[PDB]
Amino acid sequence: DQLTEEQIAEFKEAFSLFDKDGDGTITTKELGTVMRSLGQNPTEAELQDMINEVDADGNGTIDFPEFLTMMARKMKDTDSEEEIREAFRVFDKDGNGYISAAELRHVMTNLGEKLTDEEVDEMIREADIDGDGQVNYEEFVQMMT
Amino acid sequence: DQLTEEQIAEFKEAFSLFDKDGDGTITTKELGTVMRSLGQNPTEAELQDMINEVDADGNGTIDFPEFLTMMARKMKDTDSEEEIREAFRVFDKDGNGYISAAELRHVMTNLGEKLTDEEVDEMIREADIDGDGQVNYEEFVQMMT
Amino acid sequence: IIQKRVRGWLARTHYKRTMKAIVYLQCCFRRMMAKRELKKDYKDDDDK
């Protein structure tokens, strides 16, 4: 289960712009429109396959739970990973894509959501059991989802 | 002492992206970076002054309380955007709210401390500039705020 | 006066972007860690 309630809340906030009737099931052309409004970018062909799954007649609709299911079916194949890669390419002090395990634990001890000992221990464990004091930037994108 | 506990916390959080070891000390190389990030708009010569005020031989390293003392030296200044709208009026031909791209290029690279080639490139890309024309300073200061 | 404010704004803008991305990433990792912790504590019902 990728989901938690506060994710579903923002997806419903976006979907409320389209459910102007309270009907809860959206015609084919809206699917890609909602996804790109949220920021996820499937191609017209990738959308055409997801339309083939539901609309055999030229008039089908997609219920809110199948819309969330289609979003999940297209979760990690996204152009929005490339912005997170960019944030690390800005932050890197050497410009070579590798950061200190000391720097990582220090930043996480002090900044943002502010991670505890067990959360930082788990974050280091999530990268590599073979890690020798240094961490590749892309693995931070890989633990995101 | 010149900052509240909330202000100290905000500045400590930001400083902990540039201090990388958490012992309470920054390199002079990122001292400009952290101050420019924390709302300040210091000149190159003012960074040079603030370092040589602490030590004129030194070690290229500055304690967190000494960094907060540099922030204290700035925070007296009543800085706000209306004087910047007024700063662009000095380069308007008509009073229309507009600086020419040629005059702006002269302003950025002949007068004053001077922006580098990449600072100009980076700004042009962010600004959505197209052709050697003119740019509205009311809209631009709204973006700069 | 103009130059130093643009220099400030460039760094401050990419800093604002970076912080938004980092905090989103940390919130997603904190969900993942909690959904691992939840699996861990259950098997103390069996390590008995």
| DSSP per-residue letters across A67-82 | HHHHHHHTSSS-TTHH
**Contact A90/C25, CB-based, under 8 Å?**
no
CA distance A54 to chain C (A): 31
Give the span between the Cα atoms of A14 and A65, in whole angstroms: 14
Give the span between the Cα atoms of B112 and A135, in whole angstroms: 42
Strands (E) located in chain A? 25-27, 61-63, 98-100, 134-136
Give the span between the Cα atoms of C48 and C32, in whole angstroms: 27
Q: Which chain C residue shows the shortest CA-CA distance from A83?
A: C21
Task: Mark whether B8 and B20 lie in a shared domain.
Answer: yes
Give the span between the Cα atoms of A118 and A139, in whole angstroms: 19
Resolution, expressed in angstroms to one decimal: 7.5
Q: How many structural domains are present in chain B? A: 2
C-alpha closest to that of C24 among B13, B119, A87: A87
Beta bridge mates, B92: B99
Q: How many CB pairs under 8 A join A and C?
A: 41
Task: Mark whether B66 and B12 lie in a shared domain.
Answer: yes
Beta bridge mates, A100: A134
Alpha helices in A1-145 (DSSP H): 5-15, 28-38, 44-52, 64-73, 81-91, 101-110, 117-127, 138-142
Task: Mark whether B16 and B70 lie in a shared domain.
Answer: yes
Contact in structure between A124 and A105 (CB atoms under 8 Å): yes
**Contact A111/B13, CB-based, under 8 Å?**
yes
Sign of CA dihedral A19, A23, A29, A32: positive
Give the span between the Cα atoms of B135 and B128, in whole angstroms: 10
Task: Mark whether A34 and A86 lie in a shared domain.
Answer: no
Q: How many residues does chain B have?
A: 145
Give the span between the Cα atoms of A35 and A77, in whole angstroms: 13
Q: Which chain A residue shows the shortest CA-CA distance from C17?
A: A87
Task: Mark whether B87 and B29 lie in a shared domain.
Answer: no
Give the span between the Cα atoms of A33 and A3, in whole angstroms: 21
**Contact B22/A100, CB-based, under 8 Å?**
no
- Give the domain CATH number at A50: 1.10.238.10
Give the span between the Cα atoms of C42 and B120, in whole angstroms: 57
**Contact C29/A123, CB-based, under 8 Å?**
yes
Task: Mark whether A83 and A73 lie in a shared domain.
Answer: no
Q: Which of A35, A53, A77 is the last residue of a domain?
A: A77
C-alpha closest to that of B39 among B92, B79, B90, B84: B79
Q: Tell me if residue A126 falls in helix, strand or coil.
A: helix
Residue type at B143?
M
Domain that holds residue B71: 3-77
Q: A96: which DSSP letter?
A: S
Give the span between the Cα atoms of C32 and A17, in whole angstroms: 30
Task: Mark whether B82 and B117 lie in a shared domain.
Answer: yes
Chain centroid, CA B143 distance in Å: 15
Give the span between the Cα atoms of A61 and A34, in whole angstroms: 13
Give the span between the Cα atoms of B7 and B12, in whole angstroms: 9
Which residue has 């102007």 as its token pair? A20
Q: Label residue C30 exposed, middle or buried (CB < 10 Å: 0-12, 13-18, 19+).
A: middle
Task: Mark whether A72 and A90 lie in a shared domain.
Answer: no
Experimental method: cryo-EM
* Number of other CB atoms surrounding residue B31 within 10 Å: 20
User: Is the CB of residue C12 less than 8 Å away from at least one CB of chain A?
Assistant: no
Contact in structure between A15 and A72 (CB atoms under 8 Å): no
* Number of other CB atoms surrounding residue C31 within 10 Å: 16
Give the span between the Cα atoms of B23 and B20, in whole angstroms: 8
Q: Which of B77, B105, B130 is the last residue of a domain?
A: B77
Task: Mark whether A89 and A42 lie in a shared domain.
Answer: no
* Number of other CB atoms surrounding residue A14 within 10 Å: 13
Task: Mark whether B100 and B137 lie in a shared domain.
Answer: yes
CA distance B71 to chain C (A): 14
Task: Mark whether B127 and B65 lie in a shared domain.
Answer: no
Please name the member of A91, A93, A110 whose beta carbon is closest to the beta carbon of B22: A110
**Contact A87/C21, CB-based, under 8 Å?**
yes
Q: Label residue B50 exposed, middle or buried (CB < 10 Å: 0-12, 13-18, 19+).
A: buried
Give the span between the Cα atoms of A76 and C37, in whole angstroms: 23
Q: How far apart are the first and last CA of chain C?
A: 70
Beta bridge mates, A26: A62
Beta bridge mates, A63: A25
- The per-residue DSSP string of chain B comes to ----HHHHHHHHHHHTTTS-SSSSEEEGGGHHHHHHHTT----HHHHHHHHHHH-SS--SEEEHHHHHHHHHHHHTS---THHHHHHHHTTBSSSSSEEEHHHHHHHHHTSSS---HHHHHHHHHHHT--SSSEEEHHHHHHHH-
Task: Mark whether B88 and B132 lie in a shared domain.
Answer: yes
Q: Which of B26, B49, B77 is the last residue of a domain?
A: B77
Touching chains, C (3+ CB pairs < 8 A):
A, B
Residue type at B121?
D
B62 torsion bin: left (phi>0), alpha (psi -120 to 50), beta (else): beta
